DNA sequence: ATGCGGCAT
DNA sequence: ATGCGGCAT
Protein backbone atom coordinates (compact mmCIF):
# COMPACT_ATOMS: atom_id res chain seq x y z
CA UNK A 1 0.00 0.00 0.00
CA UNK A 2 0.68 3.77 -0.04
CA UNK A 3 3.55 4.18 0.90
CA UNK A 4 2.61 3.00 3.53
CA UNK A 5 -0.04 0.22 4.64
CA UNK A 6 3.01 0.95 -3.63
CA UNK A 7 -0.54 1.47 -4.64
CA UNK A 8 -1.83 -0.62 -4.61
CA UNK A 9 0.25 -1.09 -7.33
CA UNK A 10 3.60 0.17 -7.73
CA UNK B 1 8.59 0.22 12.01
CA UNK B 2 9.62 2.90 13.49
CA UNK B 3 13.35 3.51 13.71
CA UNK B 4 12.14 1.61 15.82
CA UNK B 5 10.29 -1.50 15.39
CA UNK B 6 11.10 4.49 8.12
CA UNK B 7 7.57 5.02 9.50
CA UNK B 8 5.23 3.01 7.93
CA UNK B 9 6.98 3.91 6.04
CA UNK B 10 9.23 6.13 4.34
C1' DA C 1 17.22 -9.25 13.57
C1' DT C 2 13.70 -6.67 13.91
C1' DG C 3 9.29 -4.37 11.79
C1' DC C 4 3.67 -2.94 7.33
C1' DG C 5 -0.21 -3.66 3.39
C1' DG C 6 -2.25 -8.89 1.20
C1' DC C 7 -3.49 -6.40 -4.14
C1' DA C 8 -4.21 -3.61 -8.46
C1' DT C 9 -0.33 -3.57 -11.56
C1' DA D 1 5.75 -11.01 -10.59
C1' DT D 2 5.73 -5.79 -8.56
C1' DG D 3 6.35 -2.08 -5.18
C1' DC D 4 9.41 1.42 0.53
C1' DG D 5 12.78 3.14 4.66
C1' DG D 6 18.50 1.00 4.91
C1' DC D 7 17.52 2.15 10.60
C1' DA D 8 17.36 2.88 16.15
C1' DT D 9 16.75 0.04 18.47
Known amino acids: TX ?3 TX ?3
Request: aromatic fraction near 0%; hydrophobic fraction near 35%.
Open 8 to 10: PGV
Open 3 to 5: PGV
